[PDB]
Scaffold this active site. Structure first.
Site, PDB file in Angstrom:
ATOM      1  N   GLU B  51       0.724  -1.345  -0.100  1.00  0.00           N
ATOM      2  CA  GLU B  51       0.058   0.105   0.069  1.00  0.00           C
ATOM      3  C   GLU B  51       1.012   1.260  -0.088  1.00  0.00           C
ATOM      4  O   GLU B  51       0.699   2.046   0.947  1.00  0.00           O
ATOM      5  CB  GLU B  51      -0.945  -0.115   1.080  1.00  0.00           C
ATOM      6  CG  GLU B  51      -1.535  -1.357   1.258  1.00  0.00           C
ATOM      7  CD  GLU B  51      -2.831  -1.414   2.231  1.00  0.00           C
ATOM      8  OE1 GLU B  51      -3.898  -1.329   2.066  1.00  0.00           O
ATOM      9  OE2 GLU B  51      -2.459  -1.589   3.816  1.00  0.00           O
ATOM     10  N   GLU B 127      -3.329 -10.831  -0.578  1.00  0.00           N
ATOM     11  CA  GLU B 127      -4.371 -10.497   0.470  1.00  0.00           C
ATOM     12  C   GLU B 127      -5.737 -10.972   0.021  1.00  0.00           C
ATOM     13  O   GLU B 127      -6.061 -10.747  -0.828  1.00  0.00           O
ATOM     14  CB  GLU B 127      -4.370  -9.452   1.210  1.00  0.00           C
ATOM     15  CG  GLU B 127      -3.225  -9.027   2.049  1.00  0.00           C
ATOM     16  CD  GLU B 127      -3.093  -7.784   2.564  1.00  0.00           C
ATOM     17  OE1 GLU B 127      -4.241  -7.178   3.182  1.00  0.00           O
ATOM     18  OE2 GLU B 127      -1.901  -7.056   2.336  1.00  0.00           O
TER      19      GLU B 127
HETATM   20  O1  LIG Z   1      -4.999  -3.964   2.355  1.00  0.00           O
HETATM   21  C1  LIG Z   1      -4.915  -4.437   3.479  1.00  0.00           C
HETATM   22  O2  LIG Z   1      -6.027  -5.038   4.238  1.00  0.00           O
HETATM   23  C2  LIG Z   1      -5.956  -5.435   5.595  1.00  0.00           C
HETATM   24  C3  LIG Z   1      -7.298  -4.986   6.289  1.00  0.00           C
HETATM   25  O3  LIG Z   1      -7.314  -5.533   7.496  1.00  0.00           O
HETATM   26  C4  LIG Z   1      -4.872  -4.924   6.206  1.00  0.00           C
HETATM   27  O4  LIG Z   1      -4.973  -3.477   6.882  1.00  0.00           O
HETATM   28  C5  LIG Z   1      -3.670  -5.036   5.480  1.00  0.00           C
HETATM   29  O5  LIG Z   1      -2.359  -4.617   6.323  1.00  0.00           O
HETATM   30  C6  LIG Z   1      -3.615  -4.175   4.288  1.00  0.00           C
HETATM   31  O6  LIG Z   1      -2.778  -4.563   3.299  1.00  0.00           O
HETATM   32 MG   LIG Z   2      -2.353  -0.392   4.981  1.00  0.00          MG
END
Ligand SMILES: O=C1O[C@H](CO)[C@H](O)[C@H](O)[C@H]1O
Ligand SMILES: [Mg+2]
Ligand SMILES: O=C1O[C@H](CO)[C@H](O)[C@H](O)[C@H]1O
Ligand SMILES: [Mg+2]
Ligand SMILES: [Mg+2]
Ligand SMILES: [Mg+2]
Ligand code: NA
Ligand code: NA
Ligand code: NA
Ligand code: NA
Ligand code: NA
Ligand code: NA
Lengths: 1011, 204, 193
Positions: B51, B127
């Site tokens: 991010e 993710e």
């Molecule tokens: O995109 C994301 O989503 C998650 C939400 O819990 C968390 O913040 C991770 O670190 C981030 O990379």
């Molecule tokens: Mg973040």
């Protein structure tokens, strides 16, 4: 903190880099590019004090002028004012290699300036100072308070002085260090100097301001339509009423304009840049920019309120052109370029590395006048005005980062070290941020001679990502690594491979087709023009023209880096390495230019002009075919002049206007050429003349020429019978011959013509003897030193074989009386320690007409190094004002450097028959000569010759041209054959086999008489 | 192995990563990581962080790694998950069949993403399946697609363990705390608990 | 110099990064990956003191243990010891967004340790100190003399202590800053400690 010994600290409180600013508060002044009240120059008289180290600087200096200080002009290099010595070293670093540390004894220049600042500048806005060039690092103080620090000697360092200034008198203190960790990245082969060598100024910008702007121009397939894209950034408070207007002007006519509020398109999950805006302007049938026709538009960037109140304006010249590599070719506006380039250092014989507009203009004019269309900023970003001049006059520019670590071992020890990535990145990124809007810059370079390291790969990608409009090149690590879009070798030869391990220099023709290779090849350096050089230059251009992907190169280099020193009598002379006490040093290796430091051309410049011609010619019958190599312009300022002559005697001539399209052809039918009234060779010479003067040339300028042998009528008529018969007189020590008021004397002990008499006045000071050597050219010497001999160099091979020590041994010397002449026959052998190097057999026939016909046949031991020349020499007692000859000229020309010379009748003062190379050597030769006239003497045949008041011996024993002294009489060297001068590089044998005297047996004949 | 680089709070997200001024700081977080862990066989992919949008600094560092260690692919999701700074299409929470056409950085259906014109790279979500509280609904839908599509090669669930911290009450009895329970403000409350297991490693 | 508010300065006198080292002097111990006498752990009880800002740190601390300091276990996050509150923020930075500046009220953790080094290390070779993780930036002192500075909370920072070590008792002084320009690159969605 010793910030100058920390590659992690390249600056402190320095402002971000950006394109040239002037903060005009009037749009019209921005359009016309007139001066701006918001940009002041602080150039002029400053106060300066020299210290051996930063720790020797008194703290009082920070708030009070030092009485012992002197008033000096800025910009300048303090070595040029004599405070300390400038150092000339090529590869080896001027300081011990112990990164990131420098000598404790680090020459420190303390500059200071008391100046005024008007209250209006402090009552509002931002007042910043701009140092365009400080070598090599500095700390800045304003009114006794510390402001910042900066490194990288070739890019501007700016600081905000808004909070340090007061209305009225102010004082700047600048401590400049000669050495810093930055020096490890500035190992360019040039004089090592220091100081504030570039402009200093003050720029006032509003609180809300234009902080940056990028201009791009993209086109459709046929370039009939373009879109100018301009990204503008601002600093200050964001407000909805803010607007930016980018208007494009072609003269006083506004062609396009765009207005929009701030706020870019959405970029990611967090939105976009509220402080940015991109304007896009459509432009139909844009006038394209190129080195041929430098068409420019004016872009004005106005920061203003919604209803028209101007805050400030910036602007730049815009050149609509597309640079791209497609299918292995570098294309400019869709056409494959042919780079007639040259490397150009910023050098001035008196001012050192300080550049001025006059000098820059003079260089550009000479470059264009000699058919150059491109220049490489070897090896660092140039003075900002340089790019503006190239934009307007029309030259393609390779902008290069100030990064060179040649002296490291291995060469990539720093560039492959992530610890040096920060310092390196700033030299690359701050360069792009400064010059990206200049149309003349068509290629970015990552630096030079720094091997190939991971840092280069990272920065290469950074540029490719930030500016896709320009190819990126870098020669280190083999010239064809993953960090270059162009195969850009240095001194790679045309047909000969130099298979060095790891970094071979393949023949350029071979390099292109190596399995898997598809990139274009443009030498970033070639044809090392050191001293009497550029031999073989024509071979490069024949290849460039035949192979599409061989798109040229940049000659090394433009101007000799010699400096002026004065003798005890106050007279100036040109100095080089070591002449300032500097040691270690690399002597004359700093002089590799096509022109002398004062811009006087070396003979080689003309060979380059001829080979870089934009018009090619072919002859068939009475039809001359003219082909244009221009890619965009028509020949609208050219006329073809032709002339036919019989051995220098004008027979006929005429003119025909040239009307050739770019890359087009034109057939010119010459009228009926009437047969000559005598024997001899008819020669056709054509020259392209430019009737009208241009921004870079005067009316009548010659841009191209070519010659051809036409019909030849061999003489078959024997000379008028003579009634007189030469009388031979013999003595134990001589064979004398007499005819009328003429007499010849042959020493029976030496076997050479020891004297000749006209009336009874002696004609010789030295006997007529064979000569097989020449005062070594820089190319002959290579990197061979007296204390560090390089056995491979030609001069060393000659010395080791005893060519310079060979003693003539008489084998035969007879004299016979013929019907109407006297015939002398001789034979000598030159031996060295029992080894017979050469054998010369001659016959001298003196007839009743007074003519002496000399026939020479030489044998050269196949195992002795090929000789520099095969001829005769003598010191004439005569010292005449002029030299008249029928041969190649008018300038100095050698076997491998004579394409530019023309055959004709030339007449010049004796002085022009000597080329003043700063480092003396064999010089002034003229080839293809059938007739030479000096005083009452005339020599006829087919020979090479040079004539001057300097013997070969003096030339090779003398290190500087100002040390030469005219000897008694005139030394004449008449060669039957002469070795090439080479030049592909000057540190290894570079004379091509075809120009080496390896035939083993040689023959030539000469006729000596009185006219 | 991922570089310690996240500038999520910047506006736009790439304000620092596209700024040459921050290239030095960013380069050390990447280069010193590679220098430390390059001999570990378990590490099979390098990540430029998370991010931080897509800046020119990412491209430079992407190339640096490719040059220094050609044995491992390099991935980075910032700027749309398929920029020129990633060898793997590595979206965050892109859905199986449903597109989420956000401007600039859309999250295409993963099945659809693979075949966009000109696209040929493998797709592995860095993710997916946000396991916050009572979650993982639709988890089977991802695995059915992973198995049917050769180029859909899986992903990394977000995430392993809840980031809850232990606090004690009057009677000295422990309880799980989250954002704001320490007076910390501003805070994002329970959004720090997205694991498949409780902080004590008890399975959800 | 407020090095912690300058992205151009991420370290001072820090050694180059490299793969895990143990400097074995026996090939069999290296092969079996057993302990190395040349690699010592300084984990354990250290002396700790909390300050609201680096300007609040007493100079006497550099060459003398602070009487009011506590004895705590290291490694550890001082928020877990109750010195201050851990912050849980997702996207929004825990400090005002104004790079490269951080709040003047910058929680400073002053760690110190008195240790001895066997003689042989003082007569030959190079002795370095390795901090596998310090959040988020710190300055180092050994026996009162400044050694170095380092950033990046997740990678080891190494410094050569060869010229600083003495026979007998030596004392390390480590001033840790909660916020630094390095914080702008560490905005992960997790507790800020
Ligand atoms: O995109 C994301 O989503 C998650 C939400 O819990 C968390 O913040 C991770 O670190 C981030 O990379
Ligand atoms: Mg973040
Ligand atoms: O390779 C090179 O050759 C030249 C020799 O004069 C000069 O040193 C150039 O700067 C260097 O790039
Ligand atoms: Mg430095
Ligand atoms: Mg060099
Ligand atoms: Mg810092
Ligand atoms: Na070509
Ligand atoms: Na040179
Ligand atoms: Na014309
Ligand atoms: Na000489
Ligand atoms: Na799959
Ligand atoms: Na979360």
């Amino acid at each position: 903190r010793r910030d100058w010994e920390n590659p992690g600290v390249t600056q402190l409180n320095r402002l971000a880099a950006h394109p040239p600013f002037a903060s005009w508060r009037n749009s019209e002044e921005a359009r016309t590019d007139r001066p701006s009240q918001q940009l002041r120059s602080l150039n002029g008289e400053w106060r300066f004090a020299w210290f051996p180290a930063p720790e020797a600087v008194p703290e009082s200096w920070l708030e009070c002028d030092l009485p012992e200080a002197d008033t000096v002009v800025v910009p300048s290099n303090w070595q040029m004012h004599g405070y300390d010595a400038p150092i000339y070293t090529n590869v080896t670093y001027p300081i011990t290699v112990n990164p990131p540390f420098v000598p404790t004894e680090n020459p420190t220049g303390c500059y200071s300036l008391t100046f005024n600042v008007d209250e209006s500048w402090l009552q509002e806005g931002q007042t910043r100072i701009i140092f365009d060039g400080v070598n090599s690092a500095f700390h800045l103080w304003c009114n006794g308070r510390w402001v910042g620090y900066g490194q990288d000697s070739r890019l501007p360092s700016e600081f905000d002085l808004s909070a340090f200034l007061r209305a009225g008198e102010n004082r700047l203190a600048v401590m400049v260090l000669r050495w810093s960790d930055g020096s490890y990245l500035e190992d360019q082969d040039m004089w090592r100097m220091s100081g504030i060598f570039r402009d200093v100024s003050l720029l006032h910008k509003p609180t809300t301001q234009i902080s940056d702007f990028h201009v791009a121009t993209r086109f459709n397939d046929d370039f009939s339509r373009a879109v100018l894209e301009a990204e503008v950034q601002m600093c200050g408070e964001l407000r909805d009423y803010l607007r930016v207007t980018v208007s494009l002007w072609q003269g006083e006519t506004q062609v396009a304009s765009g207005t929009a509020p701030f706020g870019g398109e959405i970029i990611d999950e967090r939105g976009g840049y509220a402080d940015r805006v991109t304007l896009r302007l459509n432009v139909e049938n844009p006038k394209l920019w190129s080195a041929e026709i430098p068409n420019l538009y004016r872009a004005v960037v106005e920061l203003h309120t919604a209803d028209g109140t101007l805050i400030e304006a910036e602007a730049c010249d815009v050149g609509f052109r597309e640079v791209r590599i497609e299918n292995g070719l570098l294309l400019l506006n869709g056409k494959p370029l042919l780079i007639r380039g040259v490397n150009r250092h910023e050098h001035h014989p008196l001012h050192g590395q300080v550049m001025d507009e006059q000098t820059m203009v003079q260089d550009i004019l000479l470059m264009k006048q000699n058919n150059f269309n491109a220049v490489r900023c070897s090896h660092y970003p140039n003075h900002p005005l340089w790019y503006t001049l190239c934009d307007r006059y029309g030259l393609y520019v390779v902008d290069e980062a100030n990064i060179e670590t040649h002296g490291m071992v291995p060469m990539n020890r720093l560039t492959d070290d992530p610890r040096w990535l920060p310092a390196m990145s700033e030299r690359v990124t701050r360069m792009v941020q400064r010059d990206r809007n200049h149309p003349s810059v068509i290629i970015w370079s990552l630096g030079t001679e720094s091997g190939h390291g991971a840092n280069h790969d990272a920065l290469y990608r950074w540029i490719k990502s930030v500016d896709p409009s320009r190819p990126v090149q870098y020669e280190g690590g083999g010239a064809d690594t993953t960090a270059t879009d162009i195969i850009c070798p240095m001194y790679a030869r045309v047909d000969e491979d130099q298979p060095f391990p790891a970094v071979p220099k393949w023949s350029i023709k071979k390099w292109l087709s190596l399995p898997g290779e598809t990139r274009p090849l443009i030498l970033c350096e070639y044809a090392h023009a050191m001293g009497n050089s550029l031999g073989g230059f024509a071979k490069y251009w024949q290849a460039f023209r035949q192979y599409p992907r061989l798109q040229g190169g940049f000659v090394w280099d433009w101007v000799d880096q010699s400096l002026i020193k004065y003798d005890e009598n106050g007279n100036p002379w040109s100095a080089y390495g070591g002449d300032f006490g500097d040691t270690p040093n690399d002597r004359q290796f700093c002089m590799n230019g096509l022109v002398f430091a004062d811009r006087t051309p070396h003979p080689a410049l003309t060979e380059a002009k001829h080979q870089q011609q934009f018009f090619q010619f072919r002859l068939s019958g009475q039809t001359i075919e003219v082909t244009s190599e221009y890619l965009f312009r028509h020949s609208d300022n050219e006329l073809l002049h032709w002339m036919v002559a019989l051995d220098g005697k004008p027979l006929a001539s005429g003119e025909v206007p040239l009307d050739v399209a770019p890359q087009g052809k034109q057939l010119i039918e010459l009228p009926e050429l009437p047969q000559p009234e005598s024997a001899g060779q008819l020669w056709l010479t054509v020259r392209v003349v430019q009737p009208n003067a241009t921004a870079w040339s005067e009316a009548g300028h010659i841009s191209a020429w070519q010659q051809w042998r036409l019909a030849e009528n061999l003489s078959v008529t024997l000379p008028a019978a003579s009634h007189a018969i030469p009388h031979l007189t013999t003595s134990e020590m001589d064979f004398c011959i007499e005819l009328g008021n003429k007499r010849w004397q042959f020493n029976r002990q030496s076997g050479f013509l020891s004297q000749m008499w006209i009336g009874d006045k002696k004609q010789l000071l030295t006997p007529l003897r064979d000569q097989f050597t020449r005062a070594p050219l820089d190319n002959d010497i290579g990197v061979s030193e007296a204390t560090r001999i390089d056995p491979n160099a030609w001069v060393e091979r000659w010395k080791a074989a005893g060519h310079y020590q060979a003693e003539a041994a008489l084998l035969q010397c007879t004299a016979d009386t013929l019907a109407d002449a006297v015939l002398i026959t001789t034979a000598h052998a030159w031996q060295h320690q029992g080894k017979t190097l050469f054998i010369s057999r001659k016959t001298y026939r003196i007839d009743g007409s007074g003519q002496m016909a000399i026939t020479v046949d030489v044998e050269v031991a196949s195992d002795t190094p090929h000789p520099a020349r095969i001829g005769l020499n003598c010191q004439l007692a005569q010292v005449a004002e002029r030299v008249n000859w029928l041969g190649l000229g008018p300038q100095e020309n050698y076997p491998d450097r004579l394409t530019a010379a023309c055959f004709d009748r030339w007449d010049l003062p004796l002085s022009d028959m000597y080329t003043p190379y700063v480092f003396p050597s064999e010089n002034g030769l003229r080839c293809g000569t059938r007739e030479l006239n000096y005083g009452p003497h005339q020599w006829r045949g087919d020979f090479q010759f040079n004539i001057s008041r300097y013997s070969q011996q003096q030339l090779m024993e003398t290190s500087h041209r100002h040390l030469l002294h005219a000897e008694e009489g005139t030394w004449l060297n008449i060669d039957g054959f002469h070795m090439g001068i080479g030049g592909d590089d000057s540190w290894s044998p570079s004379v091509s086999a075809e120009f080496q005297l390896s035939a083993g047996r040689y023959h030539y004949q000469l006729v000596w008489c009185q006219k």
